[PDB]
Design a protein around this ligand. Structure first.
Ligand SMILES: OC1C(NCCC2CCCCN2)=NCC(Cl)N1CCNCc1csc2ccc(Cl)cc12
Lengths: 27, 251, 11
């Protein structure tokens, strides 16, 4: 239910330093 | 992990270390998929060619960790195993086809800032995200190179999924539909791979649809680490999801 | 080996 949402990132609306690299690849 | 970087705190809160009781050492990576279930590679637990056949009492699971070697008091949680389940058609004889295992913990673990489960993919997420060129992320405390040696803290590297023909043409091993490969091509410039000690750990992707992290693969095998023209191979988690659900539903 | 000893309770 709460899987895959990280307390220190998604749960606080903070991005980690390289997750955007993944998103940018999903073309 | 070769050509990775230090993880941020809480960046992979599903990361699990499989730890041998005696001698006290890292065996493999693994992942937390609920409060009582951990996912890893079968070859971390059973590989007869190397006289590897661990039992429940041989091992511990350490969850919430960042440092490889230190006991992270007030942060990590250490758990005992109730039962190991290995895929009944795990092919250790040939090619590590269906390289997957589940571990049930003796007591559920408390979630925290550092301990949180990853999602397993539904058919639709798997279909959308498991495409050539799409990047996932691999984490672990394995070797920094094939021959520094070991990391002080958890390592992370982002790697693109590779086209099936390119995977097949990189190796003499028979590749199956239960495997995919990932890594940069020789011309692409960027590098990176999993290495020994990273086995059993997660290959994850962040869904752009719901912003959740899904475990698409398990670090399974490779020939060396970060060699040009070679790729890391990963267990295709969605393809074995029916077995996963069966085990959790039954036991 | 070069790991810090874990609490005996877990062993
Ligand atoms: O890998 C292998 C391995 N590789 C050689 C090719 C073979 C041979 C026999 C079966 C399958 N692959 N053989 C046996 C086993 Cl048991 N294995 C898993 C061990 N650790 C994983 C690993 C080491 S380096 C490296 C680099 C990249 C990835 Cl994804 C994984 C690895």
């Amino acid at each position: 239910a709460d899987c895959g949402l990280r307390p220190l990132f998604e749960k606080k609306s903070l991005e980690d330093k390289t997750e955007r690299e993944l998103l940018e690849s999903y073309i | 992990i070769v050509e990775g970087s230090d993880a941020e705190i809480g960046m992979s809160p599903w990361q699990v270390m499989l730890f041998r009781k005696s001698p006290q050492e890292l065996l493999c990576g693994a992942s937390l998929i609920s409060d009582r279930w951990v996912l890893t590679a079968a070859h971390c637990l059973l590989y007869p060619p190397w006289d590897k056949n661990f039992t429940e009492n041989d091992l511990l699971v350490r969850i919430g960790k960042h440092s490889r070697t230190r006991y992270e008091r007030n942060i990590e949680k250490i758990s005992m195993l109730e039962k190991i389940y290995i895929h009944p058609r795990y092919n250790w004889r040939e090619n590590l086809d269906r390289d997957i295992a589940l571990m049930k913990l003796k007591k559920p673990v408390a979630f925290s800032d550092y301990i949180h489960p990853v999602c397993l993919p539904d058919r639709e997420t798997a279909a959308s995200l498991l495409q050539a060129g799409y990047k996932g992320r691999v984490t672990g405390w394995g070797n920094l190179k094939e021959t520094k040696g070991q990391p002080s803290v958890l390592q992370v590297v982002n790697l693109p999924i590779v086209e099936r023909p390119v995977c097949k043409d990189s190796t003499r091993i028979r590749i199956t539909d239960n495997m995919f490969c990932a890594g940069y091509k020789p011309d692409e410039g960027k590098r990176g791979d999993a290495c020994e000690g990273d086995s059993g750990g997660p290959f994850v992707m962040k869904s752009p649809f719901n912003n959740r992290w899904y475990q698409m693969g398990i670090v399974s095998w490779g020939e060396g680490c970060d060699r040009d023209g070679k790729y890391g191979f990963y267990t295709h988690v969605f393809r074995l999801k029916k077995w996963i659900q069966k085990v959790i539903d039954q036991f | 080996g070069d790991f810090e000893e874990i609490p005996e309770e877990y062993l």
